[PDB]
Amino acid sequence: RNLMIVDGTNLGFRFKHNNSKKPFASSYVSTIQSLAKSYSARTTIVLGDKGKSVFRLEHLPEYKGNRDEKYAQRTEEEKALDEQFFEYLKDAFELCKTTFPTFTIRGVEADDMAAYIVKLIGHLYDHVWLISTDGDWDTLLTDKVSRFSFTTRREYHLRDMYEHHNVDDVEQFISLKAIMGDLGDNIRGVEGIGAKRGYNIIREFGNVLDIIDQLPLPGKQKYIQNLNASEELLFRNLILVDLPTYCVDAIAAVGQDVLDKFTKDILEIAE
């Protein structure tokens, strides 16, 4: 028996992506049930995102700021379609509650919570299945923790780190994320360094922290020059993308009491 952890909001947008007019609350849940069969899920946990992340907002006030800009600029009609989807997702989350243990902790991202559950109880099962189309969840990948994306109908294991992410392991992936940056989340990275260039730097000098010890890096390239002057940026990004290391801190940002209750609830489920 395995454990299945669903990235609820993500799955929601997938349904929204398929059709932005149709109520999706039933299929949403039935989809999770068919899937639970498929992966011999003994325990299935659905998580949703409620509010911005307190942890990352503290370390970067402009965290996901662009996503607000995108809302401010939408027409009256698009903003309304947005609200439709959001009410439909809340509905989806309500119906879920009648079948699978569901969770929303305002100010806590689903990924920080997914990482906590895996940490907390991942060992009580044979395999853990992460249901998300978000590859950043791949920072949780191990030989007992795999991901499943609907947009591709694919499965992601650790062996697949390179083809899917341009790095060899979870730590290198975090390093790349910290060096490279993350456009969608509005995280600035070193100017002139992307997946391939970043990877070649990590493969030669190692993880971000190791690279910090080593600045100035030899190389007359401007992206290198840039790299040598981003010590601070790297420290910043690292805490923002290092999911497995900062997940607990991330849940406790909303309170030691909320952390304690999330814990009791998880363990009782995996019992």
From Swiss-Prot:
One of its GO terms (cellular component) is viral replication complex. Changing D134K: Complete loss of enzymatic activity. GO terms for biological process: DNA replication, Okazaki fragment processing; late viral transcription; viral DNA genome replication. CDD domains: H3TH_T4-like, PIN_53EXO-like. It comes from Escherichia phage T5. Residues 171-244 form the 5'-3' exonuclease domain. Residues 63-97 are annotated as: Helical arch. Keywords: DNA replication, DNA-binding, Early protein, Endonuclease, Exonuclease, Hydrolase, Magnesium, Metal-binding, Nuclease, Potassium, Viral DNA replication. It comes from the Viruses. This is Flap endonuclease. One of its GO terms (molecular function) is double-stranded DNA 5'-3' DNA exonuclease activity.
